[PDB]
């Protein structure tokens, strides 16, 4: 299968990237170095993950070693919720660029549609635990993102965790200058996202699937929770193909024309997870995996469920 997908900005994006949320700062430099050594050319980052400096050490070392040229890498980061303000977006992007050791990002995403009060705290709370919103709307934040393209800081801009009405708001923005290139959303066999994926793809927006293994290391996991990697039905499909369960879970979104960003800090798994370009799931396999949908969403925040732009009240 082709390794890159053409974006609506004219650039090509590798369909497999390395995730970095929860990758400890003392392990992520080696993880990214290993990833680049074994073929990864796309790294998914974010300021809120608090490890961009260490990711950047790895990127810079592989560039210095001439393992890879900058033009061959596709580095993604995301604008955190406390920076949705016109006057804060550029500095937030610049801090990410500084930490990553880069002079541009290939893609910069609005991390969540919800803006929060600026300040040191990533989740500013009122005394009852509700997040404190910003009044800056998604359209003004989008205009600020467009300026980053025009200033050369980023090659492409996009969105993440936007529901279809929020995507539509951007697409209908008066004076829209650059369409979102990507919507990065949670997607795996227990949350298959058909409706939102078809909407985005019909608009030429590429979808990136996050938490493709179900984020079993998410901090709020419970022992009784569903487990994709341990689902016997998925293990059976993997065994039939002589592949691991993780490899099936990564190949699945690829065959839906999605980009996918599995996270690992384990060198053997980083290498294994990349070995997904030499087998094909049948259309029966694909439809069978889709059938496991249970609308089981692992990534959200209770503190945000009354924010006016909370994305998950809408069906999709
Ligand atoms: N835009 C957003 O709002 C958003 C939200 C969530 C995630 N994301 C992005 O998407 C990335 C991936 O999602 P995620 O981190 O939530 O979870 P994930 O990639 O679904 O799962 C990561 C977990 O799977 C384990 N794992 C990886 N490969 C494995 C294999 N071959 N066999 C067994 N276990 C394996 C990892 O263990 P080890 O690391 O210990 O090997 C880790 O515990 C994130 O890191 C982040 O970059 C974005
Ligand atoms: O947001 C991600 O990429 C993954 O999850 C997190 C990563 C972090 F480093 C810190 C926090 C989260 C997290 O709680 N993310 C969830 C989240 C964030 C913002 C808004 C909402 N919302 O429902 O509107 C949900």
> Residues with beta carbon inside 6 Å of ligand 2?
21, 46, 48-49, 81, 112, 114, 299-301, 304, 307, 310
Tokens read off for 137: 């709307």
DSSP 288-314: HHHTT---------GGGTTSTT-TTSS
Domain range for 107 is 1-316
Measured distance CA(58)–CA(52) in Å, rounded? 10
- 249 near 228, Cβ under 8 Å? yes
Resolution (A): 1.0
Sign of CA dihedral 26, 159, 251, 189: positive
49 catalytic, yes or no? yes
- 18 near 41, Cβ under 8 Å? no
Burial class (CB in 10 A: 0-12, 13-18, 19+), 148: buried
Measured distance CA(257)–CA(15) in Å, rounded? 8
Mutate to test the pocket of ligand 2, among 117, 299, 304, 313 (most ligand atoms within 8 A of CB): 299
Q: State the structure-solving technique.
A: X-ray
CB neighbour list of residue 146: distance below 8 Å, 6 or more residues apart: 157, 177, 178
Measured distance CA(250)–CA(15) in Å, rounded? 10
CA gyration radius for the chain? 19
- Total structural domains within the chain: 1
- The SS3 of residue 102 is coil
Measured distance CA(125)–CA(301) in Å, rounded? 12
For residue 94, the CA-to-ligand 2 centroid distance in Å is 21
């Amino acid at each position: 299968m082709a390794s890159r997908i053409l974006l609506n900005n004219g650039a090509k994006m590798p369909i497999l990237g390395l995730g970095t949320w929860k990758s400890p700062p003392g392990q992520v430099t080696e993880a990214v170095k290993v990833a680049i050594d074994v073929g990864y050319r796309h790294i998914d980052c974010a300021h809120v993950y608090q490890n961009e400096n260490e990711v950047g050490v790895a990127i810079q070392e592989k560039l210095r070693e001439q393992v890879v040229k900058r033009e061959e890498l596709f580095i993604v980061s995301k604008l955190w919720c406390t920076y949705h303000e016109k006057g804060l977006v550029k500095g937030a992007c610049q801090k990410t660029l500084s930490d990553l050791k880069l002079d541009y990002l290939d893609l910069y995403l609005i991390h969540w549609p919800t803006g929060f009060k600026p300040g040191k705290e990533f989740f500013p709370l009122d005394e009852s635990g509700n997040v404190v919103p910003s009044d800056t709307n998604i359209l003004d934040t989008w205009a600020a993102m467009e300026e980053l393209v025009d200033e050369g800081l980023v090659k492409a801009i996009g969105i993440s965790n936007f529901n279809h009405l929020q995507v539509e708001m951007i697409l209908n923005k008066p004076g829209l200058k650059y369409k979102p290139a990507v919507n990065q959303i949670e997607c795996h066999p227990y949350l298959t996202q058909e409706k939102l994926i078809q909407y985005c793809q019909s608009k030429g927006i590429v979808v990136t699937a996050y938490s493709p293994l179900g984020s079993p290391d998410r901090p709020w996991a419970k022992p009784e929770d569903p487990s994709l990697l341990e689902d016997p039905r998925i293990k059976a499909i993997a065994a039939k193909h002589n592949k691991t369960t993780a490899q099936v879970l990564i190949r699945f979104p690829m065959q839906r024309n999605l980009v996918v960003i599995p996270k690992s800090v384990t060198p053997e798994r980083i290498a294994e997870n990349f070995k997904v370009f030499d087998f094909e799931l049948s259309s029966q396999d694909m439809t069978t995996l889709l059938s496991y949908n249970r609308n089981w969403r692992v990534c959200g925040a209770l503190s945000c469920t009354s924010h006016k732009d909370y994305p998950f009240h809408e069906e999709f």
